[PDB]
C-alpha cells in the first residue's frame, strides 16, 4: 500500500508508451502529471495498519471500565484475536460472564481476559485511600471515596494506572465526556510541561483525513490554551505519519472582523510561531480556505499554509461538536480514530457512547502504542 | 407540658401568699411579672414534644435512601419502639442484616421494617421510565436513568413518593447536599405558590429556641427569594407553636451601610410587609440587636420587634452556614431539629453526614407529621 507507487509506475508507462508509440495524447506538462499523482497520495493516508502493527509487537495492559456494556465486549473478543492487548474488564463478573454466552463469544476469564469485581476488591482499602489521598482537598470525604470506589468503574481503572497495576484506561462509552475526564484530570495529572488539556476526533473527507480540536474539552479556550492544544496535535499527527499542516479557523477572513473571538486566533498564531517555527499554519481564514487551496490563494497567496490542511483548531468547543457531528454525517467513511485525549501523564481516552466496536478497538490500540514509550 | 401552667399558678400564688402576709417582698407590679414569666413560657417551648405524639396517633412511610449507614440503623430501632413511622431502607439487604446483628437492634427485616433491594427490585422497569420522563430533557439518557437506581438511593425513594408507594423520605447522611437536593427539586416540584426552595436549622440558645435561614440551598439569594424564605419560616415556626419574630440580619444596621447586600434586605422587608402585614419583622439589624431587646430599643425605639427574635435570615449562605455551624458548638444543647427543606411538594428534608442519630429521629419524625395533611 506504499503511496509513491502511484508516483513512479503511471509516468513510467505513459513515457514508455508515447515512445514506444501507442499514445493518443501525450502530455507536454509531464512534470504536472508527476504533480497531480501526489495530489491522490497527501489524501487516503493508511495510519492505522502500522498502528496495530507495534501493538502487536508489545501488547500492555488495557482496563476497560463498562465491562457489562455489549460493545466493549465484542472489542475484547477482537482484542485478543488479533494480539493487541490483555483486556481487564471491570464490571460484575456473573453479568459479564452470561452476557458473553448471550453473544456467543469464545473469550473466557482468566485467561483471555482478567474480571476486577467492584463489589469485591481485595485491594479496596488500598484504592479508597489512594483516591482519597487525591480528592482530600478537592471535597471528596473518606466516606465518598469508599462509594465511589463501587459505584464508578472509571474512578476504579484510574487508580490501577497510576498506581502501575495496568498501563492504560480507554473509558467512556457510556456516560458523558465531563464525568470520565474530571476523574483523570484529578488522577493521573497535566502531563509534564503542559497545563492545559485538550480532545481531538478524526474524519475522513474528500480533502483527506483531516482533525477537529477541541472537541469535548474546553468551551473557550484561552489564546495560550488554543496554542498548547494546536502543538501537541501537531506532534499526535505527526506520530501518525500524517504531514501537519494546521488551519486555525474562524468566521473572520484573514482579520475582516476584530472581535475578541477571532483576535484570540491570532494571538495563538504567533505564540505558536515563537514555540514551533518549523510547523505549517496560518489564520484565521474561513473554513472553506482551510480544505480549497484555490480559496487560500485568491485571498492570501503568500500564505504558508499549502493545500488542504489536515488539522483544523475551532475558536470554541461549540464550532467544533456541531462541525464534527455534522461532517461525519456529511462525508460517510469508517471511524479512524475516536476523540483522542491530549495531554494527561498516563496513555488514557474518552469516548462517546455513540462509538462503534472498531472505534473501540482503535482508540484502544491507539493507547498500547502510546503506552509502549513513556 | 402546659405552657400556661407557670402563668397562671405562679402569681396566683404569690396573691394569695401576699393576702395571707406571709410574703417577705409584695411584687407590687404583677402585670410585669406576668410579662416576666410569659418570656420564660416563650423562650424555652419543647415544640417537639407535641409533633412526636401527632406522629404517635398517625405513623406513615418513610423511606431512608442510606440505609445502610449505622446512625439511620440507629434511627430505626427508635423509630419502630416509639411507634412514630413505618420506615422503608433502602440498601443491599446482606449487608443491613450483618450491621444490624453487629449493632445488637432487635429490628426485623420484613417485619418491624421493610427493605428495598437497590440491584434488584421487581419495580425497576417501571421506575427508571418514571424518572426518565421527568429527566429526558434535563441532561439523563435512557441508559443513565437505569445506572442512577441501581447506585444512587436518593433517586430511588423520590421516585416512590412521587408514585405514592412512600409518604415520606428523609435522606442526606451520606454526601453533600446539593447533591441530595438536585435530585428531589426535578422530581417533586416546586410547592405551588412557591417559586424558591429553603433551608432552615434549629438551636435552642440562650436567647430562646431560634431559627436560621437559608443555610445550604441559595448561596446568594436575591430580595424576593428572600421573601418567600421569610414568609415560609413564618409558616413553619407558627405551626411548631412558636409566635415568628422575624429579624432580617446583616452588616449594616438600619442603614449604616448603602451597599447592594442591605438594599437587598430593605426591598424584601416591604415585599414581605405587602404580602402578609401580620408577621412581625424589622430589619436590617445587627446580629446582637436581634436578641437583646435592649439594643434594639436603643438603635429603634419604635420598632415593631418585640423581645429576642427567633427567626434570623441571612443575606448570603455563607453568613449562615458560618454562623449555625460556629453556634451549634457554642451552644452545646438538644439538637432540636436539623436541615429543614421548605417550598418542595412533597414531604422531604436532607441531612449533612454529621447529623446526629437524635436529629435524624427528630427529623424523620417531623415529616410523618407533614404527610399527615395535604
Not at 471535597?139 to 462509594?147: K, N, P, S
Not at 457531528?325 to 494527561?344: H, I, K, Y
Request: proline share 5%; charged share 25%.
Amino acid at each position: 500500500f506504499d503511496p509513491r507507487l502511484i508516483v513512479k509506475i503511471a509516468p513510467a508507462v505513459a513515457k514508455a508508451a508515447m515512445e514506444s508509440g501507442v499514445a493518443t495524447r501525450p502530455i507536454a506538462d509531464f512534470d504536472v502529471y508527476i504533480d497531480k499523482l501526489t495530489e491522490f497520495v497527501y489524501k487516503t493516508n493508511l495510519f492505522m495498519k502500522p498502528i496495530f502493527s507495534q501493538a502487536r509487537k508489545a501488547p500492555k495492559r488495557v482496563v476497560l471500565p463498562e465491562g457489562e456494556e455489549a460493545r466493549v465486549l465484542h472489542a475484547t473478543q477482537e482484542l485478543v484475536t488479533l494480539g493487541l492487548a490483555k483486556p481487564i474488564l471491570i464490571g460484575r463478573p456473573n453479568v459479564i460472564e452470561m452476557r458473553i454466552q448471550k453473544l456467543g463469544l469464545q473469550i473466557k476469564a482468566g485467561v483471555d481476559f482478567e474480571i476486577v469485581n467492584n463489589e469485591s476488591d481485595p485491594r479496596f482499602k488500598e484504592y479508597w485511600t489512594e483516591y482519597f489521598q487525591i480528592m482530600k482537598r478537592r471535597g471528596v470525604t473518606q466516606e465518598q471515596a469508599q462509594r465511589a470506589l463501587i459505584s464508578n468503574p472509571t474512578v476504579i481503572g484510574a487508580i490501577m494506572v497510576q498506581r502501575g497495576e495496568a498501563d492504560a484506561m480507554i473509558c467512556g462509552t457510556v456516560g458523558d465526556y465531563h464525568e470520565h475526564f474530571s476523574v483523570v484530570k484529578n488522577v493521573f495529572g497535566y502531563r509534564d510541561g503542559v497545563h492545559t488539556a485538550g480532545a481531538m476526533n478524526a474524519l475522513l473527507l474528500p480533502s483527506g483525513n483531516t482533525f477537529i480540536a477541541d472537541t469535548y474539552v474546553n468551551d473557550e479556550p484561552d489564546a495560550e490554551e488554543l496554542a498548547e492544544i494546536t502543538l501537541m496535535a501537531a506532534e499526535t499527527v505527526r506520530r501518525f505519519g500524517i504531514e501537519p499542516r494546521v488551519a486555525l479557523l474562524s468566521h473572520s477572513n484573514f482579520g475582516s472582523s476584530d472581535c475578541p473571538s477571532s483576535s484570540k486566533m491570532r494571538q495563538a498564531l504567533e505564540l505558536v510561531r515563537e514555540r514551533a517555527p518549523e510547523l505549517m499554519i496560518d489564520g484565521e481564514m474561513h473554513g472553506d480556505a482551510a480544505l480549497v487551496e484555490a480559496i487560500r490563494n485568491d485571498r492570501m497567496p503568500d500564505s504558508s499554509l499549502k493545500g488542504s490542511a489536515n488539522i483544523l483548531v475551532m475558536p470554541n468547543m461549540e464550532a467544533a461538536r456541531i462541525s464534527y457531528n455534522l461532517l461525519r454525517v456529511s462525508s460517510s467513511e469508517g471511524v479512524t480514530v475516536g476523540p483522542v485525549l491530549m495531554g494527561v501523564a498516563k496513555p488514557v481516552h474518552v469516548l462517546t457512547p455513540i462509538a462503534s466496536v472498531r472505534r473501540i478497538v482503535n482508540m484502544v490500540a491507539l493507547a498500547v502504542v502510546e503506552a509502549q514509550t513513556q
